[PDB]
Amino acid sequence: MEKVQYLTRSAIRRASTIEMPQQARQKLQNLFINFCLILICLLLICIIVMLL
Amino acid sequence: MEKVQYLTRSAIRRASTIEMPQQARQKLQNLFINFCLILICLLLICIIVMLL
Amino acid sequence: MEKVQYLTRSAIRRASTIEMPQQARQKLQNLFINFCLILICLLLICIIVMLL
Amino acid sequence: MEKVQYLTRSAIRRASTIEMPQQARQKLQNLFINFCLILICLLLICIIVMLL
Amino acid sequence: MEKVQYLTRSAIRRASTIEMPQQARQKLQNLFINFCLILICLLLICIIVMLL
């Protein structure tokens, strides 16, 4: 191998300044974007409800 | 093989906490983003219509 | 081959419920996102113009 | 080769209806998205400044 | 090798007009998008607070 041990070791070395179960990081970025859009939705609606 | 059986098995094991036909997950993330933009569009327009 | 004929056939089979020249689908997703941002721009500006 | 000449030729053939230095296209899509978010930021702020 | 030296050299040559620690560029694009969504959130909320 060597190539894998070098890649995995490179990550663990540069990721020593993080505290997440990995899955959270990936799921967060994607799920967040989607959630954000939905959030902006309900938001604009609220503003309108106030204008009425 | 072995590499495939390991990858596919790894997914089915970590995806046991989900209930979607796969296609929905992928199509949702992409289609949603696009739909969100359109949604924010009509939204800002509505707000303006109220200000008039 | 076999691998290609299987992949291409898998798409044509699952894409039988679509009606686009392919290029439109790809260009739309990307171009749309970009266009959406621009759209939200001019939108917020319009709202402000009304508040003045 | 043959595979490369076919891929590169396929692009130049389908990209004959474009006028950009390539780098602009890529940098634009990414930089634009980022810029758009910033733009929407200052925008919402402006609206608020008017409400005050 | 040759292929690597050509790729890495091609980047350093086209990236001579930049001043970032690399990691910042990648982390910025992703983290920014996410941050932007959150930003637009608190923004719409502020506007509403003013309408009340």
From Swiss-Prot, chains A, B, C, D, E:
Mutation: R9L; reported impact is: In CMD1P; impairs phosphorylation by PKA and inhibition of ATP2A1-mediated calcium uptake
GO cellular component assignments: calcium ion-transporting ATPase complex; endoplasmic reticulum; endoplasmic reticulum membrane; membrane; mitochondrial membrane; mitochondrion; perinuclear region of cytoplasm; phospholamban complex
Which residues are reported to carry the modification N-acetylmethionine? Answer: M1
Name its cellular compartments: Endoplasmic reticulum membrane; Sarcoplasmic reticulum membrane; Mitochondrion membrane; Membrane
**Protein family (similarity comment):** Belongs to the phospholamban family.
The species this protein was found in: Homo sapiens
- Please report the name of this protein according to its UniProt entry: Phospholamban
Oligomer and partners: Homopentamer. Can also form heterooligomers with other sarcoplasmic/endoplasmic reticulum calcium ATPase (SERCA) regulators ARLN, ERLN, SLN and STRIT1/DWORF. Monomer. Interacts with HAX1. Interacts as a monomer with ATP2A2; the interaction decreases ATP2A2 Ca(2+) affinity. Interacts with VMP1; VMP1 competes with PLN and SLN to prevent them from forming an inhibitory complex with ATP2A2. Interacts with S100A1 in a Ca(2+)-dependent manner.
Q: Where are the transmembrane segments?
A: 32-52
Provide the alphabetized UniProt keywords.
Acetylation, Cardiomyopathy, Disease variant, Endoplasmic reticulum, Lipoprotein, Membrane, Mitochondrion, Palmitate, Phosphoprotein, Sarcoplasmic reticulum, Transmembrane, Transmembrane helix
Give residue numbers for the modification (Phosphothreonine).
Answer: T17
Single annotated GO MF: protein homodimerization activity
Q: How does it sit in the membrane?
A: Single-pass membrane protein
Q: Where is this region: Involved in HAX1 binding?
A: 16-22
Pfam families, per database record: Phospholamban (PF04272)
**Effect of substituting R9H:** In CMD1P; impairs phosphorylation by PKA and inhibition of ATP2A1-mediated calcium uptake
